[PDB]
Structure 1
Amino acid sequence: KRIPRKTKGKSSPATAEPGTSNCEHYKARPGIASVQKATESAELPMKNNDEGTPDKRGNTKGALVNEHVEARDEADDATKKQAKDTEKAKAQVTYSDTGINNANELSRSGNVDNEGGSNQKPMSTRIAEATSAIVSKHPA
C-alpha cells in the first residue's frame, strides 16, 4: 500500500433480528442537508496572504504598488466579493468607505523588500549588477 502524494516534491444459522428496520420515518427540522452546506462553507480554511514574501531566488513576490493604495484596492475588492456573495447589486456590509478615517492603514505588497528598500529593480538583478563590477578578464 502506497499513499499517493498531495503536492509536488523536490524531485519533480442466521435470522434478521426483530429490531432492525431499513425505512426512515423522521425528517429533521433543521435540515441535515442545509446545515451541511453551510458548514462546509465555514469549514473552508483561511486564505493564504503570500504578498511580500521572498521567492526561491530572493525576489519578493507581489505587485509594485503603494502600500496604502494596495490596502484600499483590496478593501474595494472585499466589498465587491461581499456583494457577489450576497447576490445583490449593493452590499450592506462594506469594508470600504466605512466612515472612519483610516489613512494610515498599510498592507503588504511587492513594493518594499526585507531590507526596507524599493523593489524597482528585482533583487537578483541588483546583486548581479553589483558583482559584475568586480569581474576581471584574461590578460590581453
Structure 2
Amino acid sequence: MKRIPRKTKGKSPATTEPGTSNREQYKARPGIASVQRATESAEMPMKNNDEGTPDKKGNTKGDLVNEHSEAKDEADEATKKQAKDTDKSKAQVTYSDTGINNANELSRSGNVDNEGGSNQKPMSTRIAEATSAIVSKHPAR
C-alpha cells in the first residue's frame, strides 16, 4: 500500500574487489555543472498562452486591449526580457521595431468572444439581462 499525492487541486570472506578503488583525476571539459545549468533552462516547457479563451463561468479571460496593440505590447515585453537575460541596458536581439512592416499582425486578446462580438459586457451579464427581460410575476392589484 503506497499513497501518491496530487500536484493539482481536483474536483473537491574478503570483499574488497581489486578494481573498485577510486583515483579520480579527470576534469570534464566542458564541465558537468556548466552543461547541466544550460540544459535546465532549455528543459522548461513552453509557457501557456490562455488569453481570449472562455473561463469556467463562460466569460472570456484576458484584457480589453486592441489585438494589434496587444501584439505590440507583447513584442516590447519580449525585447525587454531579452535585454534582461543578457544583462544589458538595451537588447542586441530585438523583437520590436524591426525593418519589417508587420502592421497587420494580430494577437489573441480578451477583447473579442467566440461569436466575434465585443466583450465590453461579459457573456454572463448579457445572458442574465436577456433572460431577465421576459420573466413573469404573480398577479397583483
Q: How does the TM-score come out when normalised to structure 2?
A: 0.96
CA RMSD of the aligned region, Å? 0.8
Which whole-Å CA distance do the structure 1 matches of 2:67 and 2:15 have between them?
74
Match of 2:97 in 1: 97
Which whole-Å CA distance do the structure 1 matches of 2:14 and 2:93 have between them?
63
Please list the CA deviations of residues 6-38 of structure 1 after superposition, one character each: whole Å capped at 9, or x if unmatched: 10000x324210000234211001110000000
Which whole-Å CA distance do the structure 2 matches of 1:2 and 1:111 have between them?
45
SS at 1:134's partner residue?
A: coil
Which whole-Å CA distance do the structure 1 matches of 2:21 and 2:87 have between them?
44
Which whole-Å CA distance do the structure 2 matches of 1:14 and 1:139 have between them?
102
Which whole-Å CA distance do the structure 2 matches of 1:60 and 1:24 have between them?
60
Which whole-Å CA distance do the structure 1 matches of 2:86 and 2:65 have between them?
29
Runs of 5+ consecutive residues of structure 1 not aligned to the other structure: none
Which whole-Å CA distance do the structure 1 matches of 2:27 and 2:79 have between them?
38
Match of 1:6 in 2: 7
Please list the CA deviations of residues 36-82 of structure 1 after superposition, one character each: whole Å capped at 9, or x if unmatched: 00000000110000011100111001000000000000100000000
More deviation, 18-27/59-68 = 18-27
Deviation at 1:130, TM superposition (A): 0.2
Q: Structure 1: which 4+ aligned runs deviate by more than 6 Å?
A: none
Match of 2:85 in 1: 85
Match of 1:30 in 2: 30
Which whole-Å CA distance do the structure 1 matches of 2:66 and 2:14 have between them?
76
SS at 1:88's partner residue?
A: coil
Q: How does the TM-score come out when normalised to structure 1?
A: 0.97
Deviation at 1:99, TM superposition (A): 1.3
Match of 2:122 in 1: 122
User: Percent same amino acid among aligned pairs?
Assistant: 91
Deviation at 1:89, TM superposition (A): 0.3
Which whole-Å CA distance do the structure 2 matches of 1:98 and 1:21 have between them?
60
For residues 52-71 of structure 1, the aligned pairs below 5 Å read 52-71=52-71
More deviation, 22-31/96-105 = 22-31
